[PDB]
């Protein structure tokens, strides 16, 4: 709903660019502050600064000053803020939430108006850091060794693996399961490519023999994947 | 407001689907009758704008 | 700098217990109007946040009152009463008050972890990512209690780990429950070939880490 809430999603590697957009509604170009976020996975939220988007003035966060761009694209309703120099580091969630409006009679460029406490739709974003083993889906069998499988505690099938396209809809549950699930998650390895561990629960001679597989489409790198990862 | 039959009194427990001490159902019977009092007595009204 | 910081960190009740989340800030909140320029905010998994109080006190359209408070000068409790289904978010505190502001370090509110362990299903992988990759021990858990969690991932059966890394789910089981995943270093032969590899898993009411493992040849 709220046109200035953020939108778009990149991946970059260290010393690239990156870029970003928004919309002339709700918290419009007429309406608030345009002060874009980001916040790490691991993390709170921190300032990329605050614009005014027509005529386009601007305060930046002084940790990030040589590493910043700003647009009053206002014609195009964005508020098209920008990055240089990335980081692996730098690899974050980024958001568009609006200022709370001015406050006051007066007129001009307000700011002074606000802070960490953005007060509209951040609606949010992804900027990758492409540093990472870049690399196409794979769904590891998570199903057990021989002194874990065939018993009533275990769980089958397989979970995204080996690409920094980390993220896939892996979980044991593609088709040859669709419930039962453990939400293992698919974490990084050291080479930011994942290592996932989900595995879908099974009676105990499934457990030991079933067709289970896991829908492991690497997301980031938008290729299908169905692999099978059978116990025993 | 309220033009539903849902559960509704509820909201520090999780509301699943028992109607009973978990999360009751509001809209109970309205059934007024002649052998109550003329307060109790229902009545059948309209109201227009 | 302003430093808005929050006090619990996380909260770990059972749903519908009273709480509250506290911050303060270093210093300067009132603006000498004396509004008190602070705000309270959530977002649970993988949602943008958004406010639940603004101006210190002002509630967010169609808050819950028991899940909302005040701020006071450089302190502020916001509310947790009633602890309601599905509010279970990271939560903190921000600062309107001028350009550098922070947000306050996004305390998780949580589900009371019940005493349950994890299943024991972990082993290292089927012959796909084992004997065509490595027979590392490979780790994981099914319905968890978080609060005190543990896991296993290392060579020669040592029902222990260091050389290795983990991940959990959202507390969504009725336990506060959470599955898990983990992996170990080991050579892709050696792993397997010890006496054991280990796989464990344990909860915050666990005696000891759940027997999940590959005997030696059978990873």
């Given at each position: ?34 002060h ?64 709370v ?84 998650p ?47 | ?5 849902a ?41 227009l704008? | ?50 406010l ?56 998780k ?12 299903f ?30 296993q ?29 983990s ?28 027997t ?8």
């Open positions: 709903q709220v046109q200035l809430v953020q939108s778009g999603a990149e991946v970059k590697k260290p010393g690239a660019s990156v870029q970003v957009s928004c919309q002339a509604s709700a918290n419009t170009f007429t309406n608030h502050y345009i874009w976020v980001r916040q790490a996975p691991g993390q709170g939220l921190e300032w990329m600064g605050i614009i005014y988007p027509t005529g386009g003035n601007t305060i930046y966060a002084q940790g990030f000053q040589g590493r910043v761009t700003m647009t009053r694209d206002t014609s195009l309703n964005t508020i098209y803020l920008e990055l240089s120099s990335l980081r692996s580091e730098d690899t974050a969630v980024y958001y568009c939430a609006r200022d409006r001015v406050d006051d009679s007066w007129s001009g460029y307000d700011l002074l108006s606000g802070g960490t406490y953005f007060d509209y739709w951040g609606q949010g974003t992804l900027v990758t850091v492409s540093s990472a083993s870049t690399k196409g889906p794979s769904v590891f069998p998570l199903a057990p060794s021989s002194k874990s499988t065939s018993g009533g505690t275990a769980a089958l099938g397989c979970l995204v693996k080996d690409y920094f396209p980390e993220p896939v809809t892996v979980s044991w549950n593609s088709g040859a399961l669709t419930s039962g699930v453990h939400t293992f698919a974490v990084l390895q050291s080479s930011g490519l994942y290592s996932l561990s989900s595995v879908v629960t099974v009676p105990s001679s499934s457990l030991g023999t079933q067709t289970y597989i896991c829908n492991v489409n690497h997301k980031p790198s938008n290729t299908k994947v169905d692999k099978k990862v059978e116990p025993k | 407001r309220d033009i539903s039959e559960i509704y009194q509820a909201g520090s427990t999780p509301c699943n689907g028992v109607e009973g001490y978990n999360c009751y159902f509001p809209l109970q019977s309205y059934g007024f009758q002649p052998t109550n009092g003329v307060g109790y007595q229902p009545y059948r009204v309209v109201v704008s | 700098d302003i430093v808005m910081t929050q006090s619990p960190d996380s909260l770990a009740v059972s749903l519908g217990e009273r709480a509250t989340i506290n911050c303060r800030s270093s210093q300067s909140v009132l603006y000498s109007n004396n509004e008190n320029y602070l705000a309270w905010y959530q977002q649970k998994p993988g949602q943008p946040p958004k639940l109080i603004y101006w210190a006190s002002t509630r967010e359209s169609g808050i819950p009152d028991r899940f909302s408070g005040s701020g006071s000068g450089t302190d502020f409790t916001l509310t947790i009463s009633r602890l309601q289904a599905e509010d279970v978010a990271v939560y903190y505190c921000q600062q309107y008050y001028s350009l550098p502001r922070t947000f306050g370090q996004g305390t509110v949580e589900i009371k972890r019940t005493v349950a362990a994890p299943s024991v972990i082993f290292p992988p089927s012959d796909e990512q084992l004997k065509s990759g490595t027979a590392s021990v490979v780790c994981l858990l099914n319905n968890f209690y978080p609060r005190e969690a543990k896991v991932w290392k060579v020669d059966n040592a029902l222990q780990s260091g050389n290795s890394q983990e991940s959990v789910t959202e507390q969504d089981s009725k336990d506060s429950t959470y599955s898990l995943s992996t170990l270093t080991l050579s892709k032969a050696d792993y397997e070939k010890h006496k054991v590899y280990a796989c464990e898993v344990t909860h915050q009411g666990l005696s000891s880490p759940v999940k493992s590959f005997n030696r040849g059978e990873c």
